[PDB]
Design a protein around this ligand. Structure first.
Ligand SMILES: *C(=O)[C@@H](NC(=O)CCCC[C@@H](N)C(=O)O)[C@@H]1N=C(C(=O)O)C(=C)CS1
Ligand SMILES: [Mg+2]
Length: 466
């Protein structure tokens, strides 16, 4: 029954969508160790977001499924009878899921502890990680978009998916000929606005562009929005995430009765402070939780922030240089042969990352029997699942196929690079697969990937739901 499987994968990979593409395709039975299929299994290829497989596993080895993350507020000593302090410090230690509501709960504490006036300045301290915001080889033109957000120890995360280092922009039409109305979202009062957008007659054509020009903190909107259009929203990144955390904090403080009168900016706790009074603090959910929004939606910031967290754990240094050696070490300690690997970031954004399909599958079986196997597999998207927090980036793929509800896999797509790698649990054995595509001209070969994953589910003894 095994040559039929091979013949079919061989035919599927004949698709014209794979014209001039190197493809790495490996299938292995996790029970026996048997190699069911293998083509260019040792070719070194760009991973895109499949690299999070490696990061996620290392964060569980190094940090533990139990790990949470802290933020706090500090002044030189407690407030007194007048209710005054001098300077104040918001201090972040790598929480990738700090909401504006968390900032507000910490402002209430600062007030509930006797403060009524910050007489000096408010500072945002993100010194737990270094201030290298972007990887060397990320592309400048990409910097406005949430996947390319800058990297800090203190960052405010937006929405239920926890997109870090961004603000939501909204553009609402006026009457034909009047300017459009632009909201900066959270970055209101922080980011500059260059609004050049206009409202066009009803039913005309939407030509709206939302930008942050390279090396500014300006949201520039150009174009027309039709008078009858639905209002448009976009997530855009800001410069210096921690500075916006600070801005949002003084608003929170001001809202909870505390009256900040100095300015706002970056800076670390002075160190000529002996017994800093901590006036408020927050703790995130445990890393097993945080792994869900991270892995289902392929959050890049989470991945980088977990890398610099790993570098603090192994080496006292919140750095890529250090945390990437941390990831490589954790992978080794796990049983994975890392010869094929080049590690240049944790998210997969960087085109200086290299894996082989054999390596992915090694990790898959290694992470299969690890103590944390179930928390690791519960975070991988499941094929065909409607609910965004079960289906993730696979919710709209493979519905009504043998693979629906069954296949757990990580995705990842850029220009010229696409991958799908994960598990196929069945009666005919627990399978492990990795499809890595490099060099194609059209759209990503998502259908070729779905097609193989479905054949594998059929192989493992599955049928389409009807
Ligand atoms: C993972 O692959 C990650 N993707 C990206 O960051 C896309 C890279 C775009 C870069 C430009 N410069 C280009 O070259 O095209 C996340 N992955 C997914 C996913 O489906 O797995 C996303 C939905 C986007 S972010
Ligand atoms: Mg089924």
């Amino acid at each position: 029954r095994l040559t039929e499987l091979r013949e079919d994968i061989d035919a599927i990979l004949e698709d014209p969508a794979l014209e001039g593409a190197v493809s790495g395709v490996v299938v292995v039975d996790t029970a026996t160790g048997e190699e069911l299929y293998s083509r260019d299994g040792g070719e070194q290829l760009l991973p895109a977001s499949n690299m999070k497989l490696f990061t996620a596993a290392a964060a569980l080895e190094v940090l533990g499924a139990d790990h949470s993350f802290g933020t706090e507020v500090a002044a030189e000593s407690a407030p007194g009878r007048r209710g005054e302090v001098q300077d104040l410090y918001l201090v972040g230690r790598g929480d990738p899921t700090l909401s504006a509501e968390d900032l507000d709960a910490m402002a209430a504490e600062v007030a509930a502890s006797g403060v009524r006036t910050v007489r000096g300045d408010l500072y945002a301290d993100d010194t737990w990680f270094d201030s290298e915001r972007l990887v060397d080889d990320w592309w400048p033109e990409d910097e406005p978009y949430a996947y390319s957000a800058q990297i800090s120890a203190l960052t405010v995360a937006h929405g239920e998916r926890f997109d870090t280092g961004v603000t939501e922009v909204s553009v609402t039409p006026a009457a034909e000929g009047e300017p459009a109305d632009v909201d900066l979202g959270a970055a209101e009062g922080y980011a500059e606005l260059d609004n050049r957008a206009v409202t066009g007659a009803a039913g005309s054509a939407n030509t709206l562009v939302i930008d942050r020009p390279v090396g500014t903190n300006t949201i520039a909107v150009t174009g027309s929005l039709p008078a009858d259009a639905a209002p448009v929203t976009a997530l855009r990144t800001v410069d210096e995430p921690a500075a916006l955390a600070g801005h949002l904090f003084e608003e929170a403080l001001e809202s909870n009765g505390v009256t900040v009168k100095g300015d706002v900016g970056l800076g670390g706790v002075p160190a000529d402070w002996q017994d800093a009074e901590v006036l408020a603090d927050h703790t995130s959910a445990e890393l097993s939780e945080i792994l869900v929004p991270f892995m289902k939606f392929s959050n890049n910031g989470h991945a980088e922030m977990l890398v610099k967290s790993i570098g603090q754990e192994t080496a006292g240094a919140g750095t890529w240089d250090a945390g990437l050696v941390g990831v490589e070490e954790a992978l080794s300690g796990l049983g994975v042969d890392t010869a094929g690997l080049v590690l240049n970031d944790g998210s997969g954004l960087s085109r200086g990352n290299l894996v082989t399909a054999d390596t992915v599958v090694d990790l898959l079986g290694q992470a299969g029997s690890a103590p944390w196997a179930q928390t690791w597999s519960a975070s991988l998207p499941v094929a065909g699942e409607s609910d965004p927090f079960v289906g993730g980036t696979l919710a709209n793929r493979m519905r009504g196929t043998a693979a629906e509800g069954v296949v757990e896999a990580k995705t990842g797509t850029m220009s010229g690079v696409s991958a799908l790698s994960g598990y196929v649990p069945g009666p005919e054995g627990e399978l492990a697969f990795s499809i890595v595509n490099n060099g194609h001209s059209g759209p990503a070969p998502l259908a070729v990937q779905d097609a193989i994953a479905v054949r594998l589910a059929e192989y493992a003894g599955h049928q389409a739901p009807e």
